[PDB]
Short mmCIF file of C-alpha atoms and ligand atoms in Angstrom, two decimals:
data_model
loop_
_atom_site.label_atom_id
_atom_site.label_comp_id
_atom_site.label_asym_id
_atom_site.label_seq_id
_atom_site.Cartn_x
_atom_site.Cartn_y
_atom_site.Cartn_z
CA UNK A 810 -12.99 28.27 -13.46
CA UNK A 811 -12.76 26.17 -16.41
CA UNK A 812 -9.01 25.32 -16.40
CA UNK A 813 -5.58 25.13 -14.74
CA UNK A 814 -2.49 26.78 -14.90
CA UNK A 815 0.38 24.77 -15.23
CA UNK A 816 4.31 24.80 -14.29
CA UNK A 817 5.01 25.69 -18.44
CA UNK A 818 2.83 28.31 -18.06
CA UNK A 819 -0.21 27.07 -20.17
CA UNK A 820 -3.77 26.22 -19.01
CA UNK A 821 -5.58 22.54 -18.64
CA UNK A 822 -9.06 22.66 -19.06
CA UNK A 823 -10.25 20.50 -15.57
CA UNK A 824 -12.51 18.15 -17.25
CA UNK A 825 -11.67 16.03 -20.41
CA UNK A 826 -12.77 13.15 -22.17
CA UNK A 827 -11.25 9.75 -21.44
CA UNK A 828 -11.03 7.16 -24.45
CA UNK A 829 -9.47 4.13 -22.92
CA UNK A 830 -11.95 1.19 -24.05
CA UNK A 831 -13.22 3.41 -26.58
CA UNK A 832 -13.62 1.36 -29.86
CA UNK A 833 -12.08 2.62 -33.14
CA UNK A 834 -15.58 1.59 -34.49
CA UNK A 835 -17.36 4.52 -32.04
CA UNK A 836 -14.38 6.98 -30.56
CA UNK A 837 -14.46 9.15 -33.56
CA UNK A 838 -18.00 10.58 -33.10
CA UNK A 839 -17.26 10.06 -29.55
CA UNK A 840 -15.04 12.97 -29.60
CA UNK A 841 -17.00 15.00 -32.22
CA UNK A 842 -19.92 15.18 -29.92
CA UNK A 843 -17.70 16.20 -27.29
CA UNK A 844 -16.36 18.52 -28.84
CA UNK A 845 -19.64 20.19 -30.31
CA UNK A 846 -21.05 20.24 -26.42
CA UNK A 847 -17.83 21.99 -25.10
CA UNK A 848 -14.83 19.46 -23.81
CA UNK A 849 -11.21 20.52 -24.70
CA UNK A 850 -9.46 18.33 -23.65
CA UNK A 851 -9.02 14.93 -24.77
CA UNK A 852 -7.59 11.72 -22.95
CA UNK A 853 -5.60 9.33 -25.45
CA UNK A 854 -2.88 6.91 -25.34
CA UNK A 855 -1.19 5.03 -27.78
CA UNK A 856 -1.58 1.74 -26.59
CA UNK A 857 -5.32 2.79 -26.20
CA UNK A 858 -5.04 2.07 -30.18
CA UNK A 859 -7.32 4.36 -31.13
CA UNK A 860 -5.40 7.47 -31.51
CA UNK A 861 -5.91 7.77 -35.37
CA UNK A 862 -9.97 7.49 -35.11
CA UNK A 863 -9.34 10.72 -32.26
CA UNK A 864 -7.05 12.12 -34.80
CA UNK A 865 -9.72 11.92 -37.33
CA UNK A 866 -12.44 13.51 -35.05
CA UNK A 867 -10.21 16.46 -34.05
CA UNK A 868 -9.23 17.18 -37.78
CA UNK A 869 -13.25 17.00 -38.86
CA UNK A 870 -14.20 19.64 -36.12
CA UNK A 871 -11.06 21.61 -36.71
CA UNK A 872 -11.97 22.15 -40.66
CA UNK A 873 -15.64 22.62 -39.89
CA UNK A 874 -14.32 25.61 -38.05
CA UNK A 875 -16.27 24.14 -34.68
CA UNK A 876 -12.50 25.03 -32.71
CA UNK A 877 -9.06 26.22 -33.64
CA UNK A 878 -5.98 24.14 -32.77
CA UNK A 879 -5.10 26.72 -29.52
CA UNK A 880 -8.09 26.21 -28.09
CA UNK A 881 -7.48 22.14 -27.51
CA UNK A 882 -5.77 20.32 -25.10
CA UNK A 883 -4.40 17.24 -26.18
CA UNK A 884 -2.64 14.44 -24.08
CA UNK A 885 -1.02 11.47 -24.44
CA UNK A 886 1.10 8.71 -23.16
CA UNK A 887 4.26 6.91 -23.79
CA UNK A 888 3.84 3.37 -23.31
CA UNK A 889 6.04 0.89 -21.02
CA UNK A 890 7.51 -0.92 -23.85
CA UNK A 891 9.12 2.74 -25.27
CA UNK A 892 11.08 3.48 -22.07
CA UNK A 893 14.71 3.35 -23.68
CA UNK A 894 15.98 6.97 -24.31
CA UNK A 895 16.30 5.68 -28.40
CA UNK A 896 12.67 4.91 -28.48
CA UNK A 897 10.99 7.59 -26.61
CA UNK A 898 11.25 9.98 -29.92
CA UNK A 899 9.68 7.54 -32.21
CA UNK A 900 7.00 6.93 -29.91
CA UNK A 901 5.99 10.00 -29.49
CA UNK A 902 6.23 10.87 -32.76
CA UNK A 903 4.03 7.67 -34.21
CA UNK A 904 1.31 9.23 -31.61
CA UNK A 905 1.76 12.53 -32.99
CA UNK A 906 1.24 11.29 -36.74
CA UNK A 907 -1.63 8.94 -35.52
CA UNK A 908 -3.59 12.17 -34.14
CA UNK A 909 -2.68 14.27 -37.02
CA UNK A 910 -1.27 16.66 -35.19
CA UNK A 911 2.01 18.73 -34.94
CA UNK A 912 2.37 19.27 -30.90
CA UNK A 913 0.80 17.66 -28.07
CA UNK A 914 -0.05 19.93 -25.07
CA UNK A 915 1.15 17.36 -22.49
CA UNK A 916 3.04 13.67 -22.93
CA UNK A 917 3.30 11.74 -19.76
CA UNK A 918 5.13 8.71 -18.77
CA UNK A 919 2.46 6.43 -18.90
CA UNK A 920 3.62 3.59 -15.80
CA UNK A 921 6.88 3.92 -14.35
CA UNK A 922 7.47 0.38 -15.28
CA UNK A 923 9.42 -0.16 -18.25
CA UNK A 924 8.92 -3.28 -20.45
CA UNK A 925 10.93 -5.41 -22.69
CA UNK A 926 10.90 -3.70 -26.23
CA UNK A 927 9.29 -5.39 -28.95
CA UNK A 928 5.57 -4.86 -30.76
CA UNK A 929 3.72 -6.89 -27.88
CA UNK A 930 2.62 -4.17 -25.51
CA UNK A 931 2.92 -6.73 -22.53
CA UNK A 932 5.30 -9.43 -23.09
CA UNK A 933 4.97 -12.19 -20.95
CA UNK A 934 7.16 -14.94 -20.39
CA UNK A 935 6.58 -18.95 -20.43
CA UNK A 936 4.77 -18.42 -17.15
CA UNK A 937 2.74 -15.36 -17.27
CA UNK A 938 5.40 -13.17 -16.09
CA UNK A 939 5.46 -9.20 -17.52
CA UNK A 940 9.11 -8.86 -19.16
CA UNK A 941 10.95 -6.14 -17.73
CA UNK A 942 13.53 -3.28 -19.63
CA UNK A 943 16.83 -2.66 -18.31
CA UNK A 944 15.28 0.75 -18.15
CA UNK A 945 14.76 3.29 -15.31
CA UNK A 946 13.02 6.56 -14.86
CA UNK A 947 15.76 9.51 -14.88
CA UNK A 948 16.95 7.85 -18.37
CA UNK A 949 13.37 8.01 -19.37
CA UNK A 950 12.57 11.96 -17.41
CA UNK A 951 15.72 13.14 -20.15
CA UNK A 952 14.30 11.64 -22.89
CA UNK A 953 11.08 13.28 -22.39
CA UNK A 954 12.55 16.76 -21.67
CA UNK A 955 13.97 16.19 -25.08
CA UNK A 956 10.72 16.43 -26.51
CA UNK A 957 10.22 19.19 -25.21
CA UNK A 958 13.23 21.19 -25.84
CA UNK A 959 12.33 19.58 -30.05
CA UNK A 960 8.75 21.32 -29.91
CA UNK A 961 6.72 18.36 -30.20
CA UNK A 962 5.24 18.60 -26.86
CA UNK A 963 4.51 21.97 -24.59
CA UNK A 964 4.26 19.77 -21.33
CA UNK A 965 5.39 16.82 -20.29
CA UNK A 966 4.17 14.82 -16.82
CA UNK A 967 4.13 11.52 -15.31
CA UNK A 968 1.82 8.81 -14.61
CA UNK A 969 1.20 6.12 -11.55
CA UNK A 970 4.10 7.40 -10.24
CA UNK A 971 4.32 6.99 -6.09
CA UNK A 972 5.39 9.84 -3.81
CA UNK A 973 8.86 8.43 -4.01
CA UNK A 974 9.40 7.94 -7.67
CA UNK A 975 8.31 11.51 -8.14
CA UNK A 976 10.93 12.49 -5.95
CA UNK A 977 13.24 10.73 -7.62
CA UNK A 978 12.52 13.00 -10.82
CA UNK A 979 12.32 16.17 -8.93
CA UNK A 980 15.96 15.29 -7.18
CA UNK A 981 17.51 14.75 -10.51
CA UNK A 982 20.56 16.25 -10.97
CA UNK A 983 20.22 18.43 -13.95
CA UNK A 984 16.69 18.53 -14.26
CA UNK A 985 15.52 20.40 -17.04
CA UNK A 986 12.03 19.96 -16.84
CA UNK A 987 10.12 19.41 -13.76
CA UNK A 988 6.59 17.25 -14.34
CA UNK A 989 3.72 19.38 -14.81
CA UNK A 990 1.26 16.54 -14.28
CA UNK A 991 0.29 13.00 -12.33
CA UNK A 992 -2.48 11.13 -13.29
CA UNK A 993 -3.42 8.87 -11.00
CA UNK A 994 -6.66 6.70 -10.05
CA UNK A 995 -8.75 8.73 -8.06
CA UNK A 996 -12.24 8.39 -6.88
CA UNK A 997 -13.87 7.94 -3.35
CA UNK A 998 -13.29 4.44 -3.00
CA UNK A 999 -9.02 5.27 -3.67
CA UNK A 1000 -9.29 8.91 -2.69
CA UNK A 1001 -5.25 9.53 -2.48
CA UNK A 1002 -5.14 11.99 -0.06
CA UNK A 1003 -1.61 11.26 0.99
CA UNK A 1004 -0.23 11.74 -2.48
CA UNK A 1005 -2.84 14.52 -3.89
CA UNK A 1006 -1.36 16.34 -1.02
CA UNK A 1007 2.45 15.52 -1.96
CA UNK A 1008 1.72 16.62 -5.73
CA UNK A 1009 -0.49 19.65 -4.49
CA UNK A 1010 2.59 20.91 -2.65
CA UNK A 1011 4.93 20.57 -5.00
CA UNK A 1012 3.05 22.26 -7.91
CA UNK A 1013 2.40 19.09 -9.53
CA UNK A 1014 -1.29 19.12 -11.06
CA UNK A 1015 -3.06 15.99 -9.97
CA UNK A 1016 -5.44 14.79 -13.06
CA UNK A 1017 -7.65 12.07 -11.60
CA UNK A 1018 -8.65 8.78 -13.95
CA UNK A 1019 -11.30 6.41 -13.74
CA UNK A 1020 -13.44 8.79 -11.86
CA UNK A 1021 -16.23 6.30 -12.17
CA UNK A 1022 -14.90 3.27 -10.93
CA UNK A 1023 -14.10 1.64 -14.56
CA UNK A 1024 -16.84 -0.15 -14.98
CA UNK A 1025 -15.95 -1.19 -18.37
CA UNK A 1026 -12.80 -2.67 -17.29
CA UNK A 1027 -11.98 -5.68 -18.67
CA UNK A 1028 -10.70 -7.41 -15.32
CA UNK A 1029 -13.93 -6.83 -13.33
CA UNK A 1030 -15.18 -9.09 -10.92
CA UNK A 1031 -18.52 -9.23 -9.94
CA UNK A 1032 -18.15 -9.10 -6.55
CA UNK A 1033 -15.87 -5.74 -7.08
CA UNK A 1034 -17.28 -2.78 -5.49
CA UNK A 1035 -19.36 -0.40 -7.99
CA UNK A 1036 -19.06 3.13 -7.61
CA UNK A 1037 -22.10 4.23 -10.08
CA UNK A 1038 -24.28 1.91 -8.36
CA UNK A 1039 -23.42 2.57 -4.78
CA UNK A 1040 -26.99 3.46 -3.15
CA UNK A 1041 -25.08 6.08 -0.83
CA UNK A 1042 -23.69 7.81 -3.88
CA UNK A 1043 -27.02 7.90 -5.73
CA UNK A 1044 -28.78 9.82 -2.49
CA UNK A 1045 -26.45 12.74 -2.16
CA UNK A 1046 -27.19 12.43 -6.54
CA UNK A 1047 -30.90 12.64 -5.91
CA UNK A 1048 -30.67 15.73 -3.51
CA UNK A 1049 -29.17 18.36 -5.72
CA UNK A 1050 -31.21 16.32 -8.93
CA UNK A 1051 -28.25 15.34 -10.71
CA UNK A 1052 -27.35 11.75 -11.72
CA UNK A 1053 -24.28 9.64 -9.82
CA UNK A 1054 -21.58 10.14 -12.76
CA UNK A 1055 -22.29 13.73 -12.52
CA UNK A 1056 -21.72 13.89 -8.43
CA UNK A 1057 -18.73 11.25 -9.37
CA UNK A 1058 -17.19 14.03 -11.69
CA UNK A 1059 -17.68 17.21 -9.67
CA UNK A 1060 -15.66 15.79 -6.76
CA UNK A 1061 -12.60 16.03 -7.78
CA UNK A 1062 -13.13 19.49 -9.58
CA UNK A 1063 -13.47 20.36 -5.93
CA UNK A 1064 -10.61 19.17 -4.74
CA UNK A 1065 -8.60 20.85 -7.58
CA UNK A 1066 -7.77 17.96 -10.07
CA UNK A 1067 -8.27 17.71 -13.29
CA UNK A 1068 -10.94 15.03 -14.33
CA UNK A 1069 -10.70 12.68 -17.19
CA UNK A 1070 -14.55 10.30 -17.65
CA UNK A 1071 -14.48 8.02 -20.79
CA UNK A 1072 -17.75 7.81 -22.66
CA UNK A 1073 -18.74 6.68 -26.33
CA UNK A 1074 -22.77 7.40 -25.85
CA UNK A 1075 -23.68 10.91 -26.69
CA UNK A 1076 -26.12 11.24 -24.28
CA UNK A 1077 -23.93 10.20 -21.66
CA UNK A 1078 -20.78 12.51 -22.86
CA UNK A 1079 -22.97 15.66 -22.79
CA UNK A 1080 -24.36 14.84 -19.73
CA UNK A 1081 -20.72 14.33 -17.77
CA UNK A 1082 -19.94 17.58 -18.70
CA UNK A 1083 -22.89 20.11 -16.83
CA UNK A 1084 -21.20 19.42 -13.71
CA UNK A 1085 -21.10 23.53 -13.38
CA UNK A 1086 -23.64 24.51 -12.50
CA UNK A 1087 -23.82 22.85 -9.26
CA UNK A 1088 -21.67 22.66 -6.12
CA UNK A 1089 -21.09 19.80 -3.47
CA UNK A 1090 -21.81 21.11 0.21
CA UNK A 1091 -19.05 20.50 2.58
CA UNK A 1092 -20.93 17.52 4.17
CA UNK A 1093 -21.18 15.73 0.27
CA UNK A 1094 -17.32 16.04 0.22
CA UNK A 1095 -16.63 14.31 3.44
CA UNK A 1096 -18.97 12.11 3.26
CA UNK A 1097 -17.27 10.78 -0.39
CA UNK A 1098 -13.67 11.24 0.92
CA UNK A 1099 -14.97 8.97 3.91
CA UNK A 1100 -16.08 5.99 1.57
CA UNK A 1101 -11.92 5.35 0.62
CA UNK A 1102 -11.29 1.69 0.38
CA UNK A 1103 -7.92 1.92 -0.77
CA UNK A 1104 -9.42 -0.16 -3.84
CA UNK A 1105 -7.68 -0.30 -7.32
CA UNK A 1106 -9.23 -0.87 -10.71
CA UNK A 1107 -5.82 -0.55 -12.79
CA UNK A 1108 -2.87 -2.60 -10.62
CA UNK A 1109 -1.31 -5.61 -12.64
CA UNK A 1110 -0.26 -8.88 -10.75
CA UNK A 1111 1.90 -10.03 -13.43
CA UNK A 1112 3.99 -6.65 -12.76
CA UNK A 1113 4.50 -6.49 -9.08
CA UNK A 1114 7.87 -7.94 -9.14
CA UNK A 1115 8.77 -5.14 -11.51
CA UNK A 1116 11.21 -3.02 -8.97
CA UNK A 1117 9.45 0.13 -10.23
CA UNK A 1118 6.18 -1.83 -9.62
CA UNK A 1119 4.75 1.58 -8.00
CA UNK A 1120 1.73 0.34 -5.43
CA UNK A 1121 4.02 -1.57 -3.04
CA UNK A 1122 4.67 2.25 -1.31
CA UNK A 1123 1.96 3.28 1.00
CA UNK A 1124 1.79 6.31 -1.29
N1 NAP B 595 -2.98 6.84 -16.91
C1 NAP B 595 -3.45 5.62 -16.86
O1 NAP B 595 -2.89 4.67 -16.33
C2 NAP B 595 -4.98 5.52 -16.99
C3 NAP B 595 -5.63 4.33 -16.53
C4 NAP B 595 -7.02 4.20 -16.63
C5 NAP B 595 -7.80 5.25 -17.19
N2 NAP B 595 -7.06 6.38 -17.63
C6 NAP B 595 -7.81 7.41 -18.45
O2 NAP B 595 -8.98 7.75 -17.68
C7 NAP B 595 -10.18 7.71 -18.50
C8 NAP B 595 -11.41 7.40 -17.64
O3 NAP B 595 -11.16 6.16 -16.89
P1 NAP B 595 -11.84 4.78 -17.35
O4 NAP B 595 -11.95 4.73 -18.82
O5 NAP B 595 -11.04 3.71 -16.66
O6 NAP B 595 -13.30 4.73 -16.69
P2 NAP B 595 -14.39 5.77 -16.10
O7 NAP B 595 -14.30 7.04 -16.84
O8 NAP B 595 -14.32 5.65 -14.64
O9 NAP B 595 -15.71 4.94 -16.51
C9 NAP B 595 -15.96 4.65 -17.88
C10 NAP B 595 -17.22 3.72 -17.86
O10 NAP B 595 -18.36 4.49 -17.35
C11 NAP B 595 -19.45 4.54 -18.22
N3 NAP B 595 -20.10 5.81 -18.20
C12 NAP B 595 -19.65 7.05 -18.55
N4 NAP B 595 -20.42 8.05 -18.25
C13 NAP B 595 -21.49 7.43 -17.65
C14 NAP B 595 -22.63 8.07 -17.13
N5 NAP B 595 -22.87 9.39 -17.15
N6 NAP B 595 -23.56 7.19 -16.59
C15 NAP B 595 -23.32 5.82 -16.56
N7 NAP B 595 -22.22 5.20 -17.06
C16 NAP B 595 -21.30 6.07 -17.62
C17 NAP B 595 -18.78 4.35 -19.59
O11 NAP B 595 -19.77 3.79 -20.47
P3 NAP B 595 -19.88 4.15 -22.07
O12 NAP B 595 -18.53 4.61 -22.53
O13 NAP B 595 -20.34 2.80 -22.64
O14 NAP B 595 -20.98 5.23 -22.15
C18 NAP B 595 -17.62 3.33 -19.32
O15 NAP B 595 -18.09 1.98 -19.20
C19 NAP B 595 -9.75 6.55 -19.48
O16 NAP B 595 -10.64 6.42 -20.57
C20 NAP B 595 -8.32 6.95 -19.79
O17 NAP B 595 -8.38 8.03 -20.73
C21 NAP B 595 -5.69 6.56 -17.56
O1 393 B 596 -3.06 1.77 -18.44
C1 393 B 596 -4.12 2.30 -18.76
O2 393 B 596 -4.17 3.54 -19.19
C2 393 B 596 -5.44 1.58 -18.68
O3 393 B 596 -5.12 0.19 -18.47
C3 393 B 596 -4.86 -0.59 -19.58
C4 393 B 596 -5.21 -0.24 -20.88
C5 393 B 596 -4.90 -1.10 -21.94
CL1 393 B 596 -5.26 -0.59 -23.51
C6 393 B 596 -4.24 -2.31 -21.69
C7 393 B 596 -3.89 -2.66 -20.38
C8 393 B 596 -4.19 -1.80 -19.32
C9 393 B 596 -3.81 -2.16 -17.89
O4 393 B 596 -3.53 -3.35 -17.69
N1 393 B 596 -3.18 -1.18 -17.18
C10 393 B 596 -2.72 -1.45 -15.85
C11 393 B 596 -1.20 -1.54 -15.75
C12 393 B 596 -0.34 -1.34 -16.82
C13 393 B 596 1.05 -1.36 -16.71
C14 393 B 596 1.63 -1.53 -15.44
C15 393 B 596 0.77 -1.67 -14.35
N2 393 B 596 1.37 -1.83 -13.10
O5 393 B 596 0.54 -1.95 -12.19
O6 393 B 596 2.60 -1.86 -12.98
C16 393 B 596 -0.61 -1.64 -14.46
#
């Protein structure tokens, strides 16, 4: 089955196409091309700053009469420096104006950690140190659930939120809303069991990012482990004659998540998405749940003083 249900009701198709990294100069036929080959859903953010080039894309195939509106599933992200309940409006509306469009289908909270306002997306001080907001994350929950109660988003969700900090939403006295969705790093070397399981019971859908590893990250280390080009990966690949990223995507499908790989090369975007018409045995999903490393791709230094920093919890 192709997508979802969700807490509001609507469905999430369980594989979409990421677009952090994508360049403006590339993302728009990016998304073209997956939408011609059959993805729905779409990854953004804004301070992915490409959300007008996706916007452009979606528009093109929507008046070439490729898909209708309905049939889309569009998501996006407030970012850190937006947290105060004043901005959260504007934000989401400059993202909605961006895409050219009149509703997201989901808005999540992009990191719990809220930033000092200004235009730099990660203001530092004199010694390196991410500036914090005198913000917290029931103030920011309401301000979301405003958006929804307005119409400009169907869904709203969080994002690299621990165990706890979810709790903290679904506790909330006067909760209007309770998050549809976490997105969270997930692949088998950070394979999350502990909070996939607290999400999974709580009818929170779990969408998993960087289900490759990130190779294209722009903090890589050599020495980092490489999911694409682990041999062990490749073999159980080679047996049912599909390539790694393809293995790398269906895992998660099984597991019930939602799946998010980024590509900008055609070849490659059609290619992450026939991941149905094959199935991992039971031995292929052990095997990748037993390669967990508890190893990060997106966890900033500069914010782990932040006291929302989320990674300090076991999950
Ligand atoms: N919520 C958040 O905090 C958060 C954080 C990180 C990521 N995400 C979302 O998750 C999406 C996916 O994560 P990600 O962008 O970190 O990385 P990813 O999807 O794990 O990997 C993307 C990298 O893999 C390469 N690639 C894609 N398909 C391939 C294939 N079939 N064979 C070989 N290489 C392939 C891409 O190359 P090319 O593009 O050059 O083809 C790119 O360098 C993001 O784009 C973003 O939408 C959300
Ligand atoms: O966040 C993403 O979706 C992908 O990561 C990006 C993307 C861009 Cl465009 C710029 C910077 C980042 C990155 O440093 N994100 C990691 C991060 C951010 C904030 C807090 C944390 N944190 O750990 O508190 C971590």
């Amino acid at each position: 089955a192709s997508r979802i249900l969700l807490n509001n009701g609507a469905k999430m198709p369980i594989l979409g196409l990421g677009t952090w990294k994508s360049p403006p100069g590339q993302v728009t036929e990016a998304v073209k091309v997956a939408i011609d080959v059959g993805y729905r859903h779409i990854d953004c953010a804004h301070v992915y700053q490409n959300e007008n080039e996706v916007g452009v894309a979606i528009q093109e195939k929507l008046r070439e009469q490729v898909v209708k509106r309905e049939e889309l599933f569009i998501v996006s992200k407030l970012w850190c420096t937006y947290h105060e309940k004043g901005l959260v409006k504007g934000a989401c509306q400059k993202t909605l104006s961006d895409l050219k469009l009149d509703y997201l289908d989901l808005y999540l909270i992009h990191w719990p950690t809220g930033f000092k306002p200004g235009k730099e997306f990660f203001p530092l001080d004199e010694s390196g140190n991410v500036v914090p907001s005198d913000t917290n994350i029931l103030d920011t929950w309401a301000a979301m659930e405003e958006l929804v109660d307005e119409g400009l988003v169907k869904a709203i969700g969080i994002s690299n939120f621990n165990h706890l900090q979810v709790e903290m939403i679904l506790n909330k006295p006067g909760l209007k809303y309770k998050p549809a969705v976490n997105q969270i790093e997930c692949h088998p070397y950070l394979t999350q069991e502990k909070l996939i399981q607290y999400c999974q019971s709580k009818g929170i859908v779990v969408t998993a990012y960087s289900p490759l590893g990130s190779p294209d990250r722009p903090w890589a280390k050599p020495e980092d482990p490489s999911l694409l080009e682990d041999p062990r990966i490749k073999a159980i690949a080679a047996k049912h004659n599909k390539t790694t990223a393809q293995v790398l995507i269906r895992f998660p499908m099984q597991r019930n998540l939602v799946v998010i790989p980024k590509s900008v090369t055609p070849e490659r975007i059609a290619e992450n998405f026939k991941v149905f018409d094959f199935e991992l045995s039971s031995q292929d999903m052990t095997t990748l749940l037993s390669y967990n490393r508890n190893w990060r791709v997106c966890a900033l230094l500069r914010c782990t003083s932040h006291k929302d920093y989320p990674f300090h919890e076991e999950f």
